[PDB]
Amino acid sequence: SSSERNILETLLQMKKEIEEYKKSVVSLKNEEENENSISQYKESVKRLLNVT
Amino acid sequence: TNENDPAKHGDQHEGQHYNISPQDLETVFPHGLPPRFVMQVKTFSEACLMVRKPALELLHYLKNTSFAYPAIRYLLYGEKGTGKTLSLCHVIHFCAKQDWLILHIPDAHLWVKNCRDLRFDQPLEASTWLKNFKTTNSPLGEVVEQGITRVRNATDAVGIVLKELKRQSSLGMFHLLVAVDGINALWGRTTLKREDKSPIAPEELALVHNLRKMMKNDWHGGAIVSALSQTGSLFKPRKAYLPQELLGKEGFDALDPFIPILVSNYNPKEFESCIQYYLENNWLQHEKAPTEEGKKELLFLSNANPSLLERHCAYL
Amino acid sequence: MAFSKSEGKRKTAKAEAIVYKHGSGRIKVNGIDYQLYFPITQDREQLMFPFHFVDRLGKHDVTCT
Amino acid sequence: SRYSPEFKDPLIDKEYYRKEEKYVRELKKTQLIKAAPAGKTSSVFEDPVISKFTNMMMIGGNKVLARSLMIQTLEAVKRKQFEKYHAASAEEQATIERNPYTIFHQALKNCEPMIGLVPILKGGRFYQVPVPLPDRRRRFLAMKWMITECRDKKHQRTLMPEKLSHKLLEAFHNQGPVIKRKHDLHKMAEANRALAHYRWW
């Protein structure tokens, strides 16, 4: 579902970083969730915008 | 302690408790939170909330996201406490003070409650939401009453009424700032059970499916937030706030990607300030108040919490 | 700040506590605080009795198992 | 004998130790010590009266639930007081009292039977012997009467906390079932102005 994931990401952005989000999604798919995946998700979300 | 300006806006003051609409409460959320909040307001008269850290984050996210941005899920995941509904209540109060369209809703768990016996439909949550909208404050009322009363072939009926409410394009239902308490028990494994083997999957239901679709980039207005609370969790373990593990893979994929930072709890300084205020007001009743033992017991057992402070105040 | 490691037993029970030295903050229990682990008031009093006697309320962290 | 003759209970008193005595302290030290219990936790919230009340209200060995229900009933009484004072009406602190110590004192005063009844026969017929009792036995009988009255369990509609709160509010104003039982006991004792000499102890 990387296609729809990136679509929703671009929507949140408007309505570098996309590659990082895709890699984070891949890591999520690679092995079940733990903590590093959530950390990468938080990182990508922070890189999207800039207001903490 | 108390806010120095009932008028709401870009509110800050991280700690001191604000004051919700006293007599004008009917125009904010007269029907939503359980009777716990009613008892709290009755025993404290004023209030015991505050501009929490999650509330500050929500306000900051809503500041630079006016009606241009339709909806951006500000999923605030944290620890057990940290407040997961008082922030939404404060946001609704601020929106009401700013003359913005607001319509409080009860909860998601209260909507998708368990049932003894049971493309189908359900009258429970639909009728609840419609009654809440009616009691909050053209063919609109006609179709509302129709959806409230008729619940026969309710699949297409609720679909059409939802599409109409989203296509009204006018005052009312323009930007719904829902105050859900537990939007997690929906995408993962729905509480609705199946009489046969294999429980219902998130991609099978109808009414809740359309209710979620209403939040899928619909009604282009002001930004909102869906809190994945846990105080009223159902059929889930404690501390339910994870992204995918809480809603599976596809369940979270269907959601929007956005999670900021973990939230913290109360502030000890303002908590002690409010404790001293209450002491000066004479309310603890317990004769062991005028002494360091009482303050120590408070700082220990309470640990800056609302329910524990209320219990300490209403001991005897 | 020396940190000790003790253990407690009571009617076929076991519990190892790791209380640190001076350090006002919170009494944790494997990430969970005492407030989130003892919903009862008498349990709170039992857990506080050491600090209640020593008079040092909030000055040591713990990670008891 | 489940208790070992070696191990012995401790002494939880500590407020006095804040300033012959040294010898007593050394003796207490030289004693096979034991651990303290959880039910009868002699902490700051260990009120002997309320402790005994909860112990008697204990069902199936659930002293935790008993204490929780007692605290909840006290909170409900204080909430009714607030409704009569703060919650509903305006704060009228001049004609309302929120201190349960007055209720406890009124109970200790007008809920104590000062005359016991023991069926002591002499030959082959039971005779009521009004025998005096000390303060401990009188207080114990008062507590037992209060608790067994609060635990009616026969109305088949009232709940435990509601029952307790209603009975306490009824007995507060120098009435209720406990004071009526005390009056009946006093009348029965008065009815035996001569049969008070058939006591073996």
Would you give an account of this structure?
The PDB classes it as ribosome. Keywords: mitochondrial ribosome recycling Factor, ribosome. The entry is titled "Structural insights into unique features of the human mitochondrial ribosome recycling". Chain A is 28S ribosomal protein S35, mitochondrial. This is part of a larger assembly, with chains A (52 residues), B (316 residues), C (65 residues) and D (201 residues). Helix content of chain A is 71%, strand content 0%. Chain A has helices spanning 2-13, 18-29, 36-48. Chain B is built from 12 helices and no strands. In chain B, helix 4 (124-136) runs antiparallel to helix 5 (139-149) and helix 5 packs antiparallel against helix 6 (154-166). The longest helix of chain B has 14 residues, at 268-281. The two termini of chain B are 25 Å apart. Chain C has 65 residues and is α+β, with helices and mostly antiparallel strands. The longest helix of chain C is centred in the last third of the chain and has 14 residues, at 41-54. Chain C is globular. Chain D has 201 residues and is mainly α. Chain D has helices at residues 21-29, 48-57, 63-83, 100-110, 135-150, 160-172, 176-190. Chain D is globular. The relative contact order of chain D is 0.10. The A-B interface holds A 1, 4-5, 8-9, 11-12, 15, 21, 28-29, 32-33, 37-38, 41-42, 44-46, 51-52 and B 60-61, 64, 69-70, 72, 217, 242-245, 249-250, 253, 256-261.
Number of helices of chain D: 7
- The H-and-E topology of chain D, N to C, reads as HHHHHHH
Structural class of chain C: alpha+beta
Largest two-chain interface: A-B, 22 and 20 residues
Strand percentage of chain D lies at under 5%
Could you give a short account of the major beta sheet of chain D? none
**H/E order of the elements of chain C?**
EEEEHH
How many strand segments of chain C? 4
Rg from Cα of chain C: 12 Å
Q: Trace the largest sheet of chain C across and list its strands.
A: 1-2
Radius of gyration of chain D: 22 Å
Q: What does the oligomeric state look like here?
A: part of a larger assembly
Structural class of chain D: mainly alpha
**Main beta sheet of chain C:** 2 strands, antiparallel
The CA-CA distance between the termini of chain C, in Å, is 21 Å
How many β-strand runs of chain D?
0
- How many helices of chain C? The count is 2
Helix content of chain D: 40-55%
Modified residues (N6-acetyllysine) (chain C): 21
Subcellular location (chain C): Mitochondrion
Organism (chain C): Homo sapiens
Protein name (chain C): Small ribosomal subunit protein uS9m
